[PDB]
Amino acid sequence: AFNIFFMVYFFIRFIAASDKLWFMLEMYSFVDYFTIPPSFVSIYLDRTWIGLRFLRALRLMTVPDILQYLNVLKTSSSIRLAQLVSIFISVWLTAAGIIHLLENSGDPLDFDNAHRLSYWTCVYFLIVTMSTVGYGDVYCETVLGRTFLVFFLLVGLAIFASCIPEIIDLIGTRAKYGGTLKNEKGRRHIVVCGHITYESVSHFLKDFLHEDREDVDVEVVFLHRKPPDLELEGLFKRHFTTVEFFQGTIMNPIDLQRVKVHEADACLVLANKYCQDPDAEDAANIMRVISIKNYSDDIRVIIQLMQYHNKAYLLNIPSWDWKQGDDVICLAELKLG
Amino acid sequence: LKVRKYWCFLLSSIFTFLAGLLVVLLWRAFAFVCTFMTEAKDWAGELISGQTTTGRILVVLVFILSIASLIIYFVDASSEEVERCQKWSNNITQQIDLAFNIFFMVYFFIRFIAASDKLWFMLEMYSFVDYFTIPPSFVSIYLDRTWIGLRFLRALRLMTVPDILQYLNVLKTSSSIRLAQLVSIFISVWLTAAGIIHLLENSGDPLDFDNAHRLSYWTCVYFLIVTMSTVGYGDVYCETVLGRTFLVFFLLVGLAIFASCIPEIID
Ligand SMILES: [K+]
Ligand SMILES: [K+]
C-alpha cells in the first residue's frame, strides 16, 4: 500500500522530467527501478522474499534536506556536516542489506553454503570493518559475499580518502585565542592594551608581579589584535596563574565586554617606542582612551604618551579626571628629565 | 538468581536522578514575580577555590578515597558472580564501601545545598556519576544483596587527579599540565568503558538471561586497549546483543571524539 502511491509518485517525476535521458541514472530514481517491480512480485505468485527493499535506506540522504525546511539547522556550517553523516549512515545501512542478502540467500550455483546472519549482526559486521578492527568472530563465507568485501573495501577506501581528507580536515581547525574572560568571586584584574611585545610586557611583569611585593593578587589581562609570537608565548606560560591573553581590539565594544572592563580596577595603555611617527602613535593611543572612557565613565586609565605636546588632547576628554586616578606617563618628558 | 532485581536498583537510581528533575524544576522559578547565601561563599572556596586548607583538605578526601573505592570495587569485580548474596555484617570490604559513601552522599549535599546554578548543576559530569552511584549505596542495606553495580563509574574521578597535582606543585609548568589533562581523560574513559563492557557481558541480556559470557575486568581492559589501537586479535570478543550494540556506538563516538581534539591540539 505504501508503494502503491510511491510507484505512481515516480510517475510525476518521469512524466515531467526536464531531462528524459539523464534522469534514467539519477540516484533516487535508480533505487526505485530495483524496488518497484518487487512490489508486483508479491501479487502474482503469493511468495515474498527479502527483496532489494533495503535500498530504501538511501532515502536517508534526503533527511537533512527536510531539516532545512523545518529550520532545525539554520546555519550552513551545520548543514554541511549534517550532509556527510547522512551518506555515512545511508551507505553503512545499505551495504549491510547487501551483506544480509549475499549471505543468507547463498551462491546461485550450489545454494548450500549459506550462513544464517542477522541484520543486527550485519551492521555490527561493517562498523568494525570500516574502523579496520576486524574481530573475526563474524565473517562472510559465501563466495559472492567475499567478492563484495574485496570490492567495497577498495571503493570504500578510495571514497573515504577522496572527500574526507580535504573537507573534514578544514572543519577541525579552529582558533585557540578568544572567548569571554573567566569570572571569579572577588576577582581583581587590570586590562593592558596597546603595544604588546616581548621586551615591553616582560619589563612591566617584572615589577607588577615582583618576588618581594607584599601579597596582593591582581590578574593581568592582555588584549592585543595580533596573536602572540613564540618569544612572547613562553612568557605567558611562565605566568599562567596570573596572566591571560585575549585576541581582540580595545576599540571594539564587543571585545571590551569580553575582557570585563567594568570589573577591571584600571586600564593600562602601552606605547610603541619604536615608531616612525610619534604623533600618529600618540593619536591612536589617545583614541583608545576615548573608547574605554565611552564604555565606562568611572574607569581608571594610565597611558604611555610619546610626546609632551600631546598631553593637551587628553584634557579634552570630559571623562578624564586627574583626581579620580587617571594619569599620563610621558616617555619623552620622564626620560630626558 | 530467582527474579531480576537490578531493574529496581536502577529504578532507585532513576528515582533519585529524576528526583532533582522534579524537586528543583518545580520550586525555583516561582519566586521571581514577588544559610544558603553565607555558606555558598565558603563552599566555593571549601570545594573549588581553596588555596591552603579550605579546599585542598576537602578535595584530598574525595578523590583518594574514590580511588580506594575503586580498589575495593576491583575485589568484587574479579568475583565470578554478578549479583551475589552475603551477610553484610562483618565482611572484609562490604562495610568500607558503604562507610566511604556515607560521607560522600552527604558530601554531595554541600554541593547541592549551595549550588550557584540550581538547574544547570543537574547534568554536571561529576554530579551525574553520583546520581547513578548514590542509590546503589541504599540498595545493599534493605535486601542484603549486592551486585556489580554502577560503581565502576567512580573511575571518572581520575579526571580530577591532575588538578591535585597542581595543588601539590608536582607539575608547575602549564605545558605539562595540559598534556597531563589529556592522559587523565584517556585513562578514565578507558577504565569506565571496560566497566560497562564487564557489566553488559556478565549480566547478560535482560530478555533471555542465558547468553552471558564470563569475562574478567583484567580481560575487559585488554579488550579495549587493542580495540582503540585497531588491532583486533579476536581471541576475546563480545557475545551479548546489548554488548555488541555498545561496540557499534562507542567506536563511532570514540573515533569522532578522537578525531575532534587530538588532531588539533596533540599535533
Ligand atoms: K586490524
Ligand atoms: K584484526
Side-chain angles (χ1 to χ4, degrees), chain B residues 67 70 73-74 152-162 165 178-196 217 220-222 224-225 228 250 257 262:
Chain B
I67 284 170
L70 284 164
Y73 154 71
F74 291 163
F152 60 90
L153 292 171
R154 286 267 189 281
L156 291 192
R157 288 280 182 80
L158 292 191
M159 293 182 286
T160 55
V161 164
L165 292 182
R178 187 58 186 152
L179 60 93
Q181 291 290 116
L182 292 171
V183 76
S184 296
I185 295 90
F186 171 72
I187 290 184
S188 80
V189 164
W190 169 24
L191 294 177
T192 188
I196 302 168
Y217 191 67
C220 293
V221 286
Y222 165 81
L224 294 174
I225 190 56
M228 293 180 183
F250 167 89
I257 284 169
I262 286 175

Side-chain angles (χ1 to χ4, degrees), chain A residues 132-134, chain B residues 230-232:
Chain A
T132 74
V133 171
Chain B
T230 74
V231 171

Side-chain angles (χ1 to χ4, degrees), chain B residues 111-129:
Chain B
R111 318 200 68 175
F112 168 71
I113 279 169
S116 63
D117 45 353
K118 285 296 186 183
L119 168 58
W120 297 98
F121 183 79
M122 122 129 71
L123 298 180
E124 185 171 357
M125 4 294 231
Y126 296 104
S127 66
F128 203 103
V129 167

Side-chain angles (χ1 to χ4, degrees), chain A residues 89-278:
Chain A
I89 290 184
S90 80
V91 164
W92 169 24
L93 294 177
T94 188
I98 302 168
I99 294 303
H100 180 276
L101 188 153
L102 281 265
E103 292 294 326
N104 282 308
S105 174
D107 297 337
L109 289 170
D110 44 3
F111 270 127
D112 58 353
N113 57 5
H115 193 243
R116 187 256 172 194
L117 284 172
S118 159
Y119 191 67
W120 291 100
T121 313
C122 293
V123 286
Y124 165 80
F125 181 38
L126 294 174
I127 190 56
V128 306
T129 300
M130 293 180 183
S131 65
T132 74
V133 171
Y135 281 130
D137 45 354
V138 305
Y139 61 98
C140 52
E141 291 88 4
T142 62
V143 181
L144 271 300
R146 291 259 269 267
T147 315
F148 177 89
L149 273 296
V150 185
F151 284 160
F152 167 89
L153 285 173
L154 179 60
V155 305
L157 180 66
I159 284 169
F160 154 79
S162 68
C163 58
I164 286 175
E166 59 174 0
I167 71 180
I168 279 290
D169 277 20
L170 299 168
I171 315 296
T173 58
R174 272 196 173 182
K176 71 181 292 295
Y177 276 122
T180 293
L181 159 74
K182 269 83 71 176
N183 54 3
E184 293 83 3
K185 293 183 181 182
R187 177 80 273 154
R188 294 179 66 188
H189 74 112
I190 60 161
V191 190
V192 182
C193 61
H195 197 61
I196 304 295
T197 48
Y198 169 73
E199 61 86 20
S200 66
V201 171
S202 68
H203 288 127
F204 167 70
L205 278 189
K206 286 206 174 37
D207 204 83
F208 195 84
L209 301 178
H210 195 256
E211 299 85 4
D212 297 5
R213 198 176 282 282
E214 61 87 20
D215 274 339
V216 287
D217 187 21
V218 178
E219 207 200 321
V220 189
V221 179
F222 290 99
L223 182 69
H224 196 216
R225 183 180 63 83
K226 296 169 166 325
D229 69 321
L230 292 173
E231 182 66 26
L232 185 87
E233 182 65 26
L235 180 57
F236 292 153
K237 297 296 289 183
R238 292 188 296 272
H239 294 108
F240 68 88
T241 184
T242 44
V243 166
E244 293 179 353
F245 186 89
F246 298 87
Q247 181 139 339
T249 310
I250 199 72
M251 307 282 307
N252 202 342
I254 301 302
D255 301 344
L256 291 163
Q257 183 66 41
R258 281 179 35 202
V259 294
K260 299 298 293 295
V261 160
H262 65 279
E263 294 293 328
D265 189 358
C267 204
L268 270 58
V269 191
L270 301 182
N272 189 5
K273 299 171 176 60
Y274 317 107
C275 57
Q276 211 53 53
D277 201 352

